[PDB]
Amino acid sequence: ETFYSVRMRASMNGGKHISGGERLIPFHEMKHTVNALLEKGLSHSRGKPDFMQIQFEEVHESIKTIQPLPVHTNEVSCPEEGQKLARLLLEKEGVSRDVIEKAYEQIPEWSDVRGAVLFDIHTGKRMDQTKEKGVRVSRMDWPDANFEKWALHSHVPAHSRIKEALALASKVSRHPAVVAELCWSDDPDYITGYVAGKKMGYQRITAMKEYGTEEGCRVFFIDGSNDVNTYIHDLEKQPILIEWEED
Amino acid sequence: TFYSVRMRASMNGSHGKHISGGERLIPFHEMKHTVNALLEKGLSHSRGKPDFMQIQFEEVHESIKTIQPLPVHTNEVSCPEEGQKLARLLLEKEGVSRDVIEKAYEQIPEWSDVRGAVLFDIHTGKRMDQTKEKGVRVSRMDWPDANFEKWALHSHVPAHSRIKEALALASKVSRHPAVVAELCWSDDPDYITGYVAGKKMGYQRITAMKEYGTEEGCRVFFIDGSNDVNTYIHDLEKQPILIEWEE
Ligand SMILES: Nc1ncnc2c1ncn2[C@@H]1O[C@H](COP(=O)(O)OC(=O)CCCCCC(=O)O)[C@@H](O)[C@H]1O
Ligand SMILES: Nc1ncnc2c1ncn2[C@@H]1O[C@H](COP(=O)(O)OC(=O)CCCCCC(=O)O)[C@@H](O)[C@H]1O
Ligand SMILES: [Mg+2]
Ligand SMILES: [Mg+2]
Ligand SMILES: [Pt+2]
Ligand SMILES: [Pt+2]
Ligand SMILES: [Pt+2]
Ligand SMILES: [Pt+2]
Ligand SMILES: [Pt+2]
Ligand SMILES: [Pt+2]
């Protein structure tokens, strides 16, 4: 009854990143999961790939189980309104306005980062040295049956895109060096994003960009005296399962 | 357009004891079936269940050469020591000097861990490649099943995919002008038939090359060429070949 990390990446054609996925599962779900990842890479709205890697490996570290972040959905009528709300939420979560503004000026240049960017709240600058690779959070997952119940109860659609985002966001927010996350999709067909943090949980914002744009974003705002490589190793390696508790 | 699809699997981490490997060359619309076949093949291998696996695909741009399989002849022997003796004889008849053969047989035991093939230079009486435990992995060859089944029927050989794969590989490799001979037997404890292959005598199966239950296998290509080893490695890894038999 050991668990397995299963990862996928796909690209078209410096190939254009198409898709990526990370799962953490018991062995008997291997076929379904390899197939799900396969399908997800093949039928992606960003294009059809000519390169793909799928990989699995046994996880030896013990698995921590946590609840998902509390969720609140902020209806907005347009992107400029959502982005404005997001900047306000980041501030209320503890990021200084100047650090936010500095980050927003560089977000456009980070659109091609395949993973996430780490931004130091002390130095007002990018902290990681992974460049276009970014920091890829992995070994987190949310068993589907539990997620469906959570969706039902939370009156949210049971879209796997939400399951994956919230699993990621809950793992990342747990890290003591992470004050906040800002995310929206690089998929032209999906405009909802979020801001997430310990105090205000997972704050969905229903419009963060215009349809048809392919620029997405993932930034983790970091407050830590420790070195960045420690934080990177935690985000990449530490296994997390989400389990929401009905009571 | 065609796609190279590759798999490797190991136990006790990645390349750890090598469990399985596979290489396919297919049109895009056979991707799901082929990813699944490779998955299945790694999961149910007689050498153990893996705790690591990689499956990968990529578009092939080089144009595809189609060739006939090597002529086949089956040598019945009563024991391993006899098959090995016959194999040494066949290698000599194919053009390898006795001294080079003996030198190779002294090293074969330490090469059991090589995940791919070993290249042995007839000019130096020594190993030619610098890949150590990785070895040289031949790929981008395949034999459409329908055609293979006919060939098996007509040749009075069992239509086992293990033979399809070995003969596809041996035919690609023997075509390379710098390859005088190949010596192979399986690293699978349940399969004791091996072969020697070359241009003059084709694909010579030897029905006993080791004792049942041993996991030491072998794959050595004897090289006589005027070029550097990296060229030959690139040819073996990169030249796309489909087998198509005709009477
Ligand atoms: N595992 C990861 N680790 C770090 N960054 C990642 C990871 N996966 C994706 N990213 C980065 O995040 C960017 C966005 O990727 P995507 O998968 O397109 O992101 C989304 O779908 C976000 C959806 C949030 C709203 C869901 C909801 O309705 O509640 C992508 O470009 C990468 O830069
Ligand atoms: N694609 C490759 N490229 C280079 N070396 C390879 C490759 N595939 C396998 N090898 C090497 O060969 C070794 C064993 O390969 P296996 O897949 O175990 O090979 C076999 O089943 C051999 C079949 C013998 C003849 C079949 C028959 O006519 O009845 C393996 O451990 C590697 O070291
Ligand atoms: Mg094989
Ligand atoms: Mg084998
Ligand atoms: Pt493209
Ligand atoms: Pt394309
Ligand atoms: Pt607040
Ligand atoms: Pt083992
Ligand atoms: Pt094992
Ligand atoms: Pt001969």
Curated annotation (Swiss-Prot), chain A:
Reaction(s) catalysed (UniProt annotation): heptanedioate + ATP + CoA = 6-carboxyhexanoyl-CoA + AMP + diphosphate
The organism's place on the tree of life at top rank: Bacteria
Magnesium among keywords: yes
Pfam families, per the entry: BioW (PF03744)
An MF annotation (GO) of this entry: magnesium ion binding
Family according to the record: Belongs to the BioW family.
Quaternary structure and partners: Homodimer.
Protein known as: 6-carboxyhexanoate--CoA ligase
Curated annotation (Swiss-Prot), chain B:
InterPro entries: BioW
Keywords on record: ATP-binding, Biotin biosynthesis, Ligase, Magnesium, Nucleotide-binding
GO molecular function: 6-carboxyhexanoate-CoA ligase activity; ATP binding; magnesium ion binding
EC number of this enzyme: 6.2.1.14
ATP-binding is among the record's keywords: yes
Recorded superkingdom: Bacteria
GO biological process terms on file: biotin biosynthetic process
Entry cofactors: Mg(2+)
Pathway involvement of the protein, from the record: Metabolic intermediate metabolism; pimeloyl-CoA biosynthesis; pimeloyl-CoA from pimelate: step 1/1
Catalytic activity: heptanedioate + ATP + CoA = 6-carboxyhexanoyl-CoA + AMP + diphosphate
Primary enzyme class: ligase
HAMAP family: BioW
Record function comment: Catalyzes the transformation of pimelate into pimeloyl-CoA with concomitant hydrolysis of ATP to AMP.
Quaternary state and interactors: Homodimer.
Family: Belongs to the BioW family.
Name assigned to this protein: 6-carboxyhexanoate--CoA ligase
